[PDB]
Each structure stands twice: as structure tokens, then as C-alpha cells.
């Protein structure tokens, strides 16, 4: 989050919140019949909030999320939609013939290269792409 930026920000919102509350106790304009224009205020300012609790299947059990219902394909070369030590369990998951690299032997358990099914095509696989030689 980084602490410093919040501290400037907090002061601003807050000073307003308490000042608005000051205006609410103060009523004189219960009696009035104004249309002549200059005010046309309620002469009270207030604030409030409401928020909803939910967020779907947060954790399966008390322990971490692990396997969960609803299925995804995740492409390789993703670690901003990463593989986890919580995902060995997940792998398999009634895999499709649209995956041309699919299981053929067991599990790798925590990570490694895993079996790619006997390929007849290279449509799903993507060509070579190292960042090795552009580093320097």
C-alpha cells in the first residue's frame, strides 16, 4: 500500500466529516417560508455509508481455498495467473482434447514440466520466445 500517500489523504477526508456533523445539530430553519432566493439550503449536512459483506467461496474449509468449483484453462507462461502449491490437487480436472499438452502420466506434485500429449498440431503451442539475449 505504501504508508506515506495515505497519511496526506486521510487528513483531508476526515476534517470534512467531523465539520459536516457540527452543521447537523444546528437548526433554526424549522420555521421559514422562503422562495425569495438567497439561501434555499437545508442548513444541515450529514453523511453515511452501507456496504455488502459477501465474496464467493472465500475458503473451501477453514484452511486455504485449494480446489474450488468452476473450471479454467490457464495458459503457460502466466505467473500473474500463476501455478501454486495449492494447485497440484486441481490439475487433471477432466482435461479436454483441446489441450494438446495434457496429462499422460501422473502428477509432478509441486512444479516442473509435465507430460505433453502426443501432438498432431502446433496450433495451441506458441513459438519460442526467450528474453535471454536482449538482457544485455
Amino acid at each position: 500500500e505504501v504508508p506515506k500517500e495515505k497519511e496526506k489523504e486521510k487528513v483531508s477526508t476526515a476534517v470534512l466529516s467531523i465539520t459536516a456533523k457540527a452543521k447537523k445539530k444546528e437548526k433554526e430553519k424549522e420555521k421559514k417560508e422562503e422562495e425569495k432566493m438567497e439561501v434555499d439550503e437545508a442548513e444541515k449536512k450529514e453523511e453515511k455509508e452501507k456496504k455488502k459483506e459477501p465474496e464467493p467461496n472465500f475458503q473451501l474449509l477453514d484452511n486455504p481455498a485449494r480446489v474450488m468449483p468452476a473450471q479454467l484453462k490457464v495458459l503457460s507462461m502466466t505467473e500473474t495467473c500463476r501455478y501454486q502449491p495449492f494447485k497440484p490437487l486441481s490439475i487433471g480436472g477432466i482435461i479436454i482434447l483441446k489441450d494438446t499438452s495434457e496429462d499422460i502420466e501422473e502428477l509432478v506434485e509441486p512444479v516442473a514440466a509435465h507430460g505433453p500429449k502426443i501432438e498432431e498440431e502446433e496450433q495451441e503451442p506458441e513459438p519460442p520466445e526467450p528474453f535471454e539475449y536482449i538482457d544485455d
Binding site: 487528513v11 476526515a14 476534517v15 467531523i18 457540527a22 445539530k25 437548526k27
Partner: protein, 385 residues
């Protein structure tokens, strides 16, 4: 009633807004203060050294020293160094010393006397002005004598020479001598120190000349001021022993007053207001002018004055519009303020017995015949005299 109420409601509400606005300033809102002053405090407290051992700052020497008396029991000759200046220190105050090695860190705090706390009572009369009417001429005089030379300098400066230095309020109680002292003091807002005369004669000897000089000297320091000496008849009347009565005790107290008021030691434009119910006990030297200036005499209430004196007592209670004032003037007259208080109390007393919780004309009338007789009875009737 209804006319007042809209403004009353608004004043309480304006004050609410004022309270609530303070909270937002101490908690969130900062611009010069910031995180920065917080750190200034930490840094100053650690250098300064907590605990700070209290001293009293009697005087400052300009060379980077001060003469301090530490309040622990043994005094120290400290340096003025660290977070204070010579001028920043003020005389007769409490100061902070570094605990490890005493140098005077500074004056945040002021020192109040032990004496002054007991003596002092707050200024304001419970009977509002222009409703201590009745000897209405007399009420005005005190406002002219004690209050005015402090309130308005213009007349005095053109008049020239020495101003007033007191008033003496004398004559039978109930003509409101205490209410008057409090009024002038309220108006000026001069520290009102109050001591009963009986404190001047207590068991210990020489306490009288001691208390009175300290009281005045404290009034000069906290000046401008009003000293009220309430009911100085006790000097002769009281004795805890032979030494506490008698001439030595009476003289020493009188003698002190004479030097203090106009004499060598003098006083400033600080006024002494004396209440006395007897100037029989009081000397011709404290009834002498130019340390009393105008004396105020209250005489017994007159037939017409008595109706106005009665109104004041009636205002403190519930307001009458059904009491016959003539019956009171007819029954007794050329009797004190204290007699009008006596008619009022007795009416309240009969109503209390029934558990009637008001006074009416009826309560005043029933009680009034017994009270007049009772006045005569207060002084001995013996067997049949």
C-alpha cells in the same frame, strides 16, 4: 417568556457548534503543528529530563544564572540555560529543573499561594443590581468610591491628588453590605478576597497582624483588587484565652491596619472594603478618612424605604402581588433590615409545617404578629420586666 425563548435556544446551540469544532482541530486538522511539533516535544522532554524537579523562580540574574529554591527542601543556585530566556522566566512562579543536574529549563506553570485559595470566593451578588434598592442612594455611593477610581480614571486625573482607598459599610445588618462589595468587585472583575474578622483573632497569637498583611500584600501582587473584611466586631468580642482577648490582641490588629492602608508601606489603587455591624468596637483611627475616604452609613429603614427593602426579600422567594406592605410599615418601623428578614422567614416556617410549599399574604400575616412581639422578647424580658 416566549420573547426570550427563541434567542435562548439559539445561544445554547451556537455554543454546541463551538465545542464540536474544537475536536476536529486537535484530532485531524493541522497546518503549522503537524507531525513536526510532536517530535519537538519528544526531543525537548528527553533533553529536559523527566522527572523535572520543581523549583520556584524568585529572580533572574542576567549572565546565565537564576536563584531557584527547589521545592524538595534544600535550595539550589542554578543556571538559566536550556529552553528558556531570562525574560521568559517570571517571578513567583513554578519552574522545571533538569533532575540529573539542576539548570532551569523553563516556566510553563504559575504558582498560586496556599493562602489565597481559602480566602477567595467568587464575585457576583445573588441579588442583582437595582434590586438591592432601598437606601438606593447609598448603593450608588460604593460604585463611586471603590469601583469608579479603577473603572473611570478621567474624573480623578482632572480632580488631581490622591484617589480613594476604601469605604466602610456600617449600620444595622440587612441593608445588604456584603451584596454591595460583591457588586463592584464583579463589575471591575478585581480579585475578590474575602476573610471574616474572626480569623484575625484565633487561638494562636499574632495570627491577626500576620493574616491581614499577607492578604493585602497578595492583593497588591494580584492588583487591581478588592479586599473584603467581613464583620469586624470579633476582635474584642472573642477570646480563646486571656492573651486572645484584651488590649495586646486588639491593638496589634488595629495598628497593622493603620500602617497598611495609607502609611509608609502603603497600597496601590487596591481598595479595602470593611463591613462592620458595630463601630463601637472600631477606633476613631479606622473611621478616620484618607484610609477609608467616604464612609457609608445606613440608617434604620424609613416607612417608605421599608416597602423597597421588603421587595428584595420577596424577590429571592416568590414574587408577591398580594402582600399588603402597609401592614408591615404600621406594625413595626425604625427596626433593621434584619427585622424584614425575620418576618419573611417566619412565614416560610409556618408554611413548611403544613407542607404548604408556597408563601402567600396569609402566611405573612399569621406570622407577623408573633414576630413583632418576638423582636422585643429577643432581648431579655426576665420573670416579668
Amino acid at each position: 417568556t416566549q420573547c426570550r425563548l427563541k434567542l435562548l435556544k439559539l445561544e445554547r446551540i451556537k455554543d454546541y457548534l463551538l465545542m464540536e469544532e474544537e475536536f476536529i482541530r486537535n484530532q485531524e486538522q493541522m497546518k503549522p503543528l503537524e507531525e513536526k511539533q510532536e517530535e519537538e516535544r519528544s526531543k525537548v522532554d528527553d533533553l529536559r529530563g523527566t522527572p523535572m524537579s520543581v523549583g520556584t523562580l524568585e529572580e533572574i540574574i542576567d549572565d546565565n544564572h537564576a536563584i531557584v529554591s527547589t521545592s524538595v527542601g534544600s535550595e539550589h543556585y542554578v543556571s538559566i540555560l536550556s529552553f528558556v530566556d531570562k525574560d521568559l522566566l517570571e517571578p513567583g512562579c513554578s519552574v522545571l529543573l533538569n533532575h540529573k543536574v539542576h539548570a532551569v529549563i523553563g516556566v510553563l506553570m504559575d504558582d498560586t499561594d496556599p493562602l489565597v485559595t481559602v480566602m477567595k470566593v467568587e464575585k457576583a451578588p445573588q441579588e442583582t443590581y437595582a434590586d438591592i434598592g432601598g437606601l438606593d442612594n447609598q448603593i450608588q455611593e460604593i460604585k463611586e468610591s471603590v469601583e469608579l477610581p479603577l473603572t473611570h480614571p478621567e474624573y480623578y486625573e482632572e480632580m488631581g491628588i490622591k484617589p480613594p482607598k476604601g469605604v466602610i459599610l456600617y449600620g444595622p445588618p440587612g441593608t445588604g453590605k456584603t451584596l454591595l462589595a460583591k457588586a463592584v468587585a464583579n463589575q471591575t472583575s478585581a480579585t475578590f478576597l474575602r476573610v471574616v474578622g474572626s480569623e484575625l483573632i484565633q487561638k494562636y497569637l499574632g495570627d491577626g497582624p500576620k493574616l491581614v498583611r499577607e492578604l493585602f500584600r497578595v492583593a497588591e501582587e494580584h492588583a487591581p483588587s478588592i479586599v473584603f473584611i467581613d464583620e469586624i466586631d470579633a476582635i474584642g468580642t472573642k477570646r480563646y484565652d486571656s492573651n486572645s482577648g484584651g488590649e495586646r490582641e486588639i491593638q496589634r490588629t488595629m495598628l497593622e491596619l493603620l500602617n497598611q492602608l495609607d502609611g509608609f508601606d502603603s497600597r496601590g489603587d487596591v481598595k479595602v472594603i470593611m463591613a462592620t455591624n458595630r463601630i463601637e468596637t472600631l477606633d476613631p483611627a479606622l473611621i478616620r478618612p484618607g484610609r477609608i475616604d467616604r464612609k457609608i452609613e445606613f440608617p434604620l429603614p424609613d416607612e417608605k424605604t421599608k416597602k423597597r427593602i421588603f421587595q428584595i426579600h420577596t424577590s429571592r422567594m416568590t414574587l408577591a402581588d398580594d402582600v399588603t406592605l402597609d401592614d408591615l410599615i404600621m406594625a413595626k418601623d425604625d427596626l433593621s433590615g434584619a427585622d424584614i428578614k425575620a418576618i419573611c422567614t417566619e412565614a416560610g416556617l409556618m408554611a413548611l409545617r403544613e407542607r404548604r410549599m408556597k408563601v402567600t399574604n396569609e402566611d405573612f400575616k399569621k406570622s407577623k404578629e408573633n414576630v413583632l412581639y418576638k423582636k422585643q422578647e429577643g432581648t431579655p424580658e426576665g420573670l416579668y420586666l
